[PDB]
Amino acid sequence: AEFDADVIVDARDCIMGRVASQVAEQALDGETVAVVNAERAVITGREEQIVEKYEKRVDIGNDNGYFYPKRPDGIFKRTIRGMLPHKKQRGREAFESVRVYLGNPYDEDGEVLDGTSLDRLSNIKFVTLGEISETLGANKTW
Amino acid sequence: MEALGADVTQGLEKGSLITCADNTGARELKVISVHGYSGTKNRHPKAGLGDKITVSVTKGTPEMRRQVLEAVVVRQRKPIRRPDGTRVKFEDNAAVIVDENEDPRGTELKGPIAREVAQRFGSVASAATMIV
Amino acid sequence: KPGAMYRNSSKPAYTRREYISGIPGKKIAQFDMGNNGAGPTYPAQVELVVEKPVQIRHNALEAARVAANRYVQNSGAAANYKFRIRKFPFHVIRENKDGMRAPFGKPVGTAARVHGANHIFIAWVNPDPNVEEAWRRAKMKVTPTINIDSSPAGNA
Amino acid sequence: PRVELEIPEDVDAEQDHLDITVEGDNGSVTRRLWYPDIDVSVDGDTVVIESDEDNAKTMSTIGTFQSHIENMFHGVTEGWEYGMEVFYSHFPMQVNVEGDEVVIENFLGEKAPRRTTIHGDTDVEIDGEELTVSGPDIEAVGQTAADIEQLTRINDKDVRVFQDGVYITRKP
Amino acid sequence: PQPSRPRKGSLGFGPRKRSTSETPRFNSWPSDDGQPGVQGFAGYKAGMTHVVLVNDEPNSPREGMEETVPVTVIETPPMRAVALRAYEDTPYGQRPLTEVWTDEFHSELDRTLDVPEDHDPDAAEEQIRDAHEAGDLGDLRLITHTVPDAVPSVPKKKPDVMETRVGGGSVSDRLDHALDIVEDGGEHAMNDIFRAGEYADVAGVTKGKGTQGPVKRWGVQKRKGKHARQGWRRRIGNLGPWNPSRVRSTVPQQGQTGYHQRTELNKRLIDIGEGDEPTVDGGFVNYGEVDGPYTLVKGSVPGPDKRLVRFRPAVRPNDQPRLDPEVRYVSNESNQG
RNA sequence: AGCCUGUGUACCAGGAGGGGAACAACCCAGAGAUAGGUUAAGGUCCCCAAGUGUGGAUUAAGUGUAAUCCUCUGAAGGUGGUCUCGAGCCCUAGACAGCCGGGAGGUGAGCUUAGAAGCAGCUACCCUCUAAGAAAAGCGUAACAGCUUACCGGCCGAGGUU
RNA sequence: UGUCCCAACGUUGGGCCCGGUGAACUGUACAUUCCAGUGCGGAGUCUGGAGACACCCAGGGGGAAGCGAAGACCCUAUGGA
RNA sequence: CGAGUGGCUUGCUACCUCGAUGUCGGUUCCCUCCAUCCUGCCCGUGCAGAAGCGGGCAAGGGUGAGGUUGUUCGCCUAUUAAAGGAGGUCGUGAGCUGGGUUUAGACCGUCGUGAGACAGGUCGGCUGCUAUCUACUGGGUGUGUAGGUGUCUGACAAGA
RNA sequence: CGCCACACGGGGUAAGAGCUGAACGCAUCUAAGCUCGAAACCCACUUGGAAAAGAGACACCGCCGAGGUCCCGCGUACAAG
């Protein structure tokens, strides 16, 4: 609720990894970022294999635990955390100044970062984070 | 199989020595297995009223002795519950030697039989003197 | 025993029968097949070329040869063609069958050393290459990958 | 590459985005035609399928898009029809259309009715031991015909002996 | 060879720790089929007796015949829906929106809540209808409580409060149905929700047994034969293999057993009456005398005598309802002897 | 064999510092202290200093993002998955495929055989009509019939085939 | 005939809480770990990730190749008996 | 005949431990693998049916009781849908057992002049420790979120 | 040892059965698209779960008083707590 984001990024039809890499770099530069429409973010590849990887991550675990997100919400956030030294003071600060959202709770329409957009007209092998979450068992709350 | 129409607490195990309630020449029977039954680790296979059990003859006529035959449990000391909640128990444990078709190998059944055994083995029942 | 044990040419040449005794006989039946009465006076000449230097036990030679010639009876027992296996198993091979003590093994067989690009087999046929098939079956029973090569034959 | 399909006088074909719709006296069929770098557009009197690439995979889809469109043309005018024949040896098989699904009863004596739901605007008119599956959407019709046949599939016993079932008699 | 064998106890009811609320909390509600109606009710366990019934089962070779059936008597006096809570659908699931309270409160509801002295029913109601206009309205439930004072055998007067979902026709129709119930005084009864012969799911916090060993808590064997005389009688063989070198949470160990919540499925409601017809001679041991609104549940119900139990229309029934079974005899014989 | 035992050399042992995720001997590098600068190996999407660099092409498997290696497997064998280069032959005198039509008679050849008629077996395999059509390449029949290959013509229209 | 099927309830002394009395074993350091990898090839501490708010009570002993004993087996010593 | 995969057997090597990492088997209790014995869904058949045989996907669940033997293994009996195999320091002795192996006593056979020897047989022959850390099962006290009562939500976690 | 309760059904797949369909005019279950299809997967159902550091939501009461602890009589609870 209420997040003074210095930047609002729209993930719709963008390559999650390429967005994250840039959101990571900016948060470490002191920027407060908000990723919007996570559910509509995309990742290239053969859906069958992609899903296997994420399903494996869900299954992995033990008493110590391996909490892996299923909602496109966290999936995206965990992706970013993997690009930050989240256990260091600086890293945790940067990570905590970044939040991912389902849809867009803001008024402004986020901006699209360069080199992160995927042309649906010249690409058929890719998937939606939302599709992944539905496969994982998430509750489509979007 | 068909519902006995009564709940049973198996009062017998593999190895139990019971009475042969018929005139086949077999007096004592030793339970070896219970038809259609599979137990669980360390559990002694159990048998009660209305079960078809494989058996061996411990006592009786030389020709009948040592033979491995099939039979049906007709009576057991351990109580059984009937639909109206009443419990029913007998004076001893007994079984009647049967064949492939489940027809008594003998001609006459000695002692009473539980009514429930009828709803399963007709020819055994229709050979009963007393059916409690 | 597996070819894994003797297919490599990493050991010294060991062929001096004047210093080695008890060498098993070869299982290879013949080297000249078909019409050996006639000389290579045929239109077509196909060859099976080994693509890697390897050692081929007389075991595989016999199996490779039989599988090919036995099949070349798509032409008949007295068919018009001649088949040649030009290599001979000169390399004596041992086995250490005590543990690693006094391990010089004892003679257990023989193998032929073939260098990549040599032809092990050579057939001579009239435009009737059933031989090309006799070979798909032959390089099936020898360690290396192989090249089926046709020399005199512009009748494609 | 580029191919041009002159649309039939009897038909009108509109398309926005990756969806093409074809309407004729016999109906309307809308399809999604999505493939990397292949543009499908209605240029007045002709539908155009074109792409800047010519690799095998591309040509394959182009040809596929074409037949898909022509098939739509045909379905909105002449339509598509599959003819089927119910057949039984001992048990009189009863095939009826109830709702949006064809039901089959007494198959090989079965007490439980076997059924299948019809696809789209496909009409399954049954007359005696003859069935006629028809509609403007070849996809839908073709499946409904198939499903009907599949519905009598048997794996348990020798098919050569137990031949009962409904079969596709005439393919369009 | 080592014969196979299922693990000891289920791993689906853990962790096996003490329950947070002695008052059960359903985590599932029936489907919105019939007319609008509160999807649950509550009462207090009293004890057990048996009843003779006429075989109701149409598929039983005994249909129509006498039959002894075990029954747990549960005092089910009326309850009171004191408010209507509204949830809204959001990107993070359902969240409470607002509530519609009343003014008529049971004399002792202040023993648990800080009863409302100033509330705006209409504003709440407005906020809800606007939500519904916008289509963000999530299911509707009623804040409910019991009247223990109505049950003499139960020492407590402090009411037990729980939220129960309202499933009905349309959202608009059941929204209204809710408000109606609440506005009155919320006073409703077992009759209004269940009919004898239907199947219900009963929830409750089991009888507590404090700490117990593996044998009793998980069903592991006792040391056998000679092993039972060496110094170990009720301890498992080992906490695990050498590797992984840690004790896995899956190995049966000592701890809290009992006093856990349990939702026992498909319980048939043999009868819903009022009076002292089901009471036993001498009184229900460690409970008291029954003489008021009651329910006869087939078989057993989790929890001890006096504990609050909850009813809910079966969410996954196996059989079709066979209404109002004929009860030929209810035993009142002393439970002492 | 991260085996045993030689040999030449450089290294570890007794060798820091940079790189290699970690890691005696792999790469750079041999090093007094302090300071500025430029490189080496290696690296430049983030973690992480430096490119989401440029021209072009391939790959759809997450292949791969793995110099060396006990450590990084993947083989014989196979692939109308796809891209590229070459050779031969056929083609607007209409090719390749498909669809339509034709596939005729002497004559169901002779021989054998009750029988045999394209087609059990044996021999032969001739000439007529014609724009084609075997003394029949494959099914089929008890033997016929029937169904098709060869062969010709039409429709079609551009590359095709090895 | 409770050795077993298959375990239950009970008795007494402990155990648990309180007053009083009051040791020993053991301790390079650090230490909330888990999964993998690596390493003299059997890591709480290296590397990568994952998990992890602190303190305390009871428990049964998975790990610390747990504590205890300069291996009693085997070999070696120009050892001993 | 050729090419491989595994790391359960057996062998090789002598890298690790001789200021000790407690043996075999069994037992108890937990997790896992799939090269699937049963069960689900399938393909072929020398598939009429019934009963099978062979193959594919598939590890959710199940795979049990007994007679000889210390046995692992294995042989045998009756049941069974089936009574699969394998990894976890040949899982599991700060858990049990102690039948075998493998101390000191003794006997037999064989070998030796003898002491005495013999994966030959045989009778008898011991099982230590009060948990510091860590791990987990359960139970509390505090702090953080930042006054209280009551009711909820559900990121995730467990299930056969 | 007694008694009660413990689904079905959706969704997506594997093997497999097919549809439409091209590269390759034909053919083709596959290349793009699609219909089905396992005790397996996801949901459903049960249990835990504001320490989820984005550390939550709602209603009412209260900030000089709401509520709570201690206290007393007791257990539907319990080794201390």
Ligand SMILES: *C(=O)[C@H](Cc1ccccc1)NC(=O)CCCCCN
């Ligand atoms: C043979 O395996 C020896 C037998 C033996 C040796 C000495 C005395 C009596 C029996 N057994 C052992 O060497 C066991 C060693 C135990 C080492 C444990 N760390």
Ligand SMILES: [Cl-]
């Ligand atoms: Cl986990």
Ligand SMILES: [Cl-]
């Ligand atoms: Cl970090």
Ligand SMILES: [Cl-]
């Ligand atoms: Cl693509």
Ligand SMILES: [Cl-]
């Ligand atoms: Cl048995």
Ligand SMILES: [Cl-]
């Ligand atoms: Cl035990």
Ligand SMILES: [Cl-]
């Ligand atoms: Cl130097």
Ligand SMILES: [Cl-]
């Ligand atoms: Cl990947």
Ligand SMILES: [K+]
């Ligand atoms: K040692």
Ligand SMILES: [Mg+2]
């Ligand atoms: Mg046992």
Ligand SMILES: [Mg+2]
């Ligand atoms: Mg059959």
Ligand SMILES: [Mg+2]
């Ligand atoms: Mg003892």
Ligand SMILES: [Mg+2]
């Ligand atoms: Mg009583």
Ligand SMILES: [Mg+2]
């Ligand atoms: Mg009585």
Ligand SMILES: [Mg+2]
């Ligand atoms: Mg040195």
Ligand SMILES: [Mg+2]
């Ligand atoms: Mg940088």
